[PDB]
Amino acid sequence: KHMMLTKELVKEAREKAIRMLEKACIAITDEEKEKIEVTDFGLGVLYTFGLEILVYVNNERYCAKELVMFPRQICPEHRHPPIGSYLGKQETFRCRWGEVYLYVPGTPTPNPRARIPEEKKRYFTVWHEIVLRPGEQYTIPPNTLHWFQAGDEGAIVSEFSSQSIDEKDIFTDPNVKRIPEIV
Amino acid sequence: HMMLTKELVKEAREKAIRMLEKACIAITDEEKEKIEVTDFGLGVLYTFGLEILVYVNNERYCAKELVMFPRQICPEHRHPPIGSYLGKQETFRCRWGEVYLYVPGTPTPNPRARIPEEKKRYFTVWHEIVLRPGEQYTIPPNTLHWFQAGDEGAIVSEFSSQSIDEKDIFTDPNVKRIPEIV
Ligand SMILES: OC[C@H]1O[C@](O)(CO)[C@@H](O)[C@@H]1O
Ligand SMILES: OC[C@H]1O[C@](O)(CO)[C@@H](O)[C@@H]1O
Ligand SMILES: [Mn+2]
Ligand SMILES: [Mn+2]
């Protein structure tokens, strides 16, 4: 069934993300702990498709975030398009802990590490693999299709970017709604 | 006073690497060789100095890790407009240790920072912001600021618009930003 993001699911996920941040020695304030965003992308299977996000700062000039991912959690394929005169978000990912499998346009990598549910494979169209372990980075230019899945222990991945406007992101999966609906 | 030598730089790079490791911040072997050590041209690295890792710096944004040994001071400066570029805006986030940041405003009584008496004239802003791990402050462009780490040192992340270090304006006319490693 097309399941639902509940308050209890959100609380459970927020607490798990906080433990992961603490394990990686990343200090976060009590106020920030309350502002960790939990999204299941409107797909109803948070532990399959989902992200736990801390926004450190986001303004017209720049943005920085911490993306926390549970084991094998997937961020559905999307891109950050131009918005009016804004070029669109460019971002640099830096893995801080665990490992993540990032996919961008290019020649399909053989034997990719990511495992996508069979019924959703149609909504993953780019297959050039970049594996990031702690300390490693990759930069995604604006309006570029990408998606990612954490490894079997999960991941913490920093974002450094231009202004973020999540509401304007374009997803390949037409079922995705970026902004959560918590019951 | 001294000149910044290759040996002093390598010693400071190694100490900054150990501090990053203590804070559990992963860095690549390539990044270890690219940590910048500056004494701002003032010849007292352990008084005025910074060890910097630039994670990324382009036209759209910049992120750095600033490592500071106990009581290292960044001399007072601002990031000005450059042509049509507004100038760098930056957000600092303390990751480890503690740092004393000073910005324009009413002088704070009993500041935590300790500055050399003979350099006081080149520190002109005195409104104090203390940042402990997890805490942040944002400096608008063309704003005078300086900072000193606490008695354990500090690791302070920067999130900012494009960085152009060469165009920074320092209050101390003795400061030279761009290195002279002999
Ligand atoms: O909106 C989808 C998510 O994608 C990211 O850029 C990672 O690609 C996050 O900043 C964002 O919240
Ligand atoms: O150049 C002076 C230094 O000041 C900072 O913005 C911190 O204020 C660093 O990015 C820079 O390297
Ligand atoms: Mn993205
Ligand atoms: Mn600055």
Author numbering:
A (entry chain AAA): -2 to 180
B (entry chain BBB): -1 to 180
The authors write:
Here we present the biochemical and physical characterisation of a thermostable lyxose isomerase from a Thermofilum species (TsLI) which shows high thermal stability and is highly specific for the substrate lyxose having little activity for other sugars. D-lyxose isomerase (LI, EC 5.3.1.15), is an important aldose-ketose isomerase reported to catalyze the reversible isomerization reaction between D-xylulose and D-lyxose, as well as between D-fructose and D-mannose and several other D- and L-sugar substrates. The overall fold of TsLI is a cupin-type β -barrel, with two α helices at the N-terminus, followed by the cupin barrel made up of two antiparallel β-sheets. The conserved manganese binding site is located within this pocket and is co-ordinated by the side chains of residues H75, H77, H143, and E88.
For the fructose TsLI complex the four potential tautomers were modelled into the electron density and the best fit was observed for the isomer β-D-fructofuranose. The two complex structures of TsLI with a bound β-D-mannopyranose or β-D-fructofuranose are very similar overall, and superimpose with an RMSD of 0.2 Å. This contributes to a highly restrictive substrate binding pocket that is likely to reduce the binding of other pentose sugars and to also affect the positioning of the linear form of hexoses such as D-mannose for catalysis. The TsLI shows an unusually high specificity for D-lyxose in comparison to D-mannose. This high specificity has enabled the slowly reacting substrates D-mannose and D-fructose to be trapped in the active site of TsLI in crystal complexes.
